[PDB]
C-alpha cells in the first residue's frame, strides 16, 4: 500500500484542448502546459499564431520562429503543469 | 586572421532584398524574415501583383491584413531563406 509521491500537476492533452480560445488558451511547449491567456494581446507575434496551436504540440511552431532568450525566460511565468506521461512519445 | 563572431541565422540586407523585385526573382520581407517567393508567384491564390507590389519594403502588414489561413502560414516556411539584417530593423 506504499504510495508514489506526487510532484508536478499533470494535464492530459484532451483537457488542454478545451482551453482553446481568447477566453482561456493553454499551449503545450516541450512537454509543459502554459496558460498564456494574459499574454495573448501582448504577444509580439500576435494572438492568431498562438490560438491556432490550441490542443496540439506547439513546440515545433515555437522553435521555428527563433524566439529570443528573453522570450524563453518569459515562458516560465505562464507555466501551469506538465503534460500527462501517457500523452508523450516514449 | 583574428577572432570573428558568428550568427545563428543567415542575414540579408534590405538593399539585397530590394534587387529581387521582378518575376525573374522576387523576395519579400514578412515579420523580420526574408522569403524567396519567385517560384510561388504563379501559384499564389491572391495573384502575382499583390506580391510584386511589396518588393523592397516590409510586407508584414499587407500579409497580416489578408487573414491568411494556418495552411498559408505553414506554406510560408517553405520559402524562407534568411532573416533580415539586424541593422535594417526599426527601433
Ligand atoms: C507560449 C509562450 C510564448 C512566448 C512567451 C512568446 C514570446 C515572444 C516574444 C517575446 C517575442 C518577441 C521576439 C523575441 O523575443 O524572440 C515573440 C515573437 C514571436 N512569437 Fe512568440 N511567444 C510564445 C509562443 C509563440 C508561439 C507558440 C508561436 C507560434 C505558433 C509564436 C510565434 C511568434 C512569432 C511569429 C514572433 C515574431 C513576431 C514579429 O516580429 O512579427 N510565439 N514571441
Ligand atoms: C510566401 C508568402 C505568402 C504565402 C505562402 C501566401 C499564401 C497564400 C495562400 C495559401 C492563400 C489562399 C488563402 C489562404 O489559404 O489563406 C493566399 C491568399 C491571398 N494572399 Fe497570400 N501568401 C503570401 C504572401 C502574401 C502577401 C505578401 C500578400 C499581400 C501583399 C498576400 C495577399 C493574398 C490575398 C489578397 C489573397 C486572397 C484573398 C484571401 O482569400 O484572403 N499574400 N495567400
Ligand atoms: Mg514591380
Swiss-Prot record, chain B:
This is Cytochrome b5 type B. One of its GO terms (cellular component) is intracellular membrane-bounded organelle. One of its GO terms (molecular function) is heme binding. The modification N6-acetyllysine is found at residue 19. Keywords: Acetylation, Electron transport, Heme, Iron, Membrane, Metal-binding, Methylation, Mitochondrion, Mitochondrion outer membrane, Phosphoprotein, Transmembrane, Transmembrane helix, Transport. The modification N6-methyllysine is found at residue 24. Heme binds at residues 44, 68. Component of a complex composed of cytochrome b5, NADH-cytochrome b5 reductase (CYB5R3) and MTARC2. It is found in: Mitochondrion outer membrane. Cytochrome b5 is a membrane-bound hemoprotein functioning as an electron carrier for several membrane-bound oxygenases. The modification Phosphoserine is found at residues 8, 22, 69. One of its GO terms (biological process) is response to oxidative stress. Belongs to the cytochrome b5 family. Disulfide bonds: none annotated. It comes from the Eukaryota. The gene is CYB5B. Residues 9-85 form the Cytochrome b5 heme-binding domain.
Amino acid at each position: 500500500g506504499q504510495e508514489v509521491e506526487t510532484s508536478v500537476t499533470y494535464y492530459r492533452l484532451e483537457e488542454v484542448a478545451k482551453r482553446n480560445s481568447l477566453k482561456e488558451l493553454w499551449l503545450v511547449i516541450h512537454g509543459r502546459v502554459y496558460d498564456v491567456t494574459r499574454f495573448l494581446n501582448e504577444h509580439p507575434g500576435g494572438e492568431e499564431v498562438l490560438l491556432e496551436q490550441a490542443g496540439v504540440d506547439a513546440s515545433e511552431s515555437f522553435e521555428d520562429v527563433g524566439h529570443s532568450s528573453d522570450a524563453r525566460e518569459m515562458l516560465k511565468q505562464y507555466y501551469i503543469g506538465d503534460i500527462h506521461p501517457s500523452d508523450l512519445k516514449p
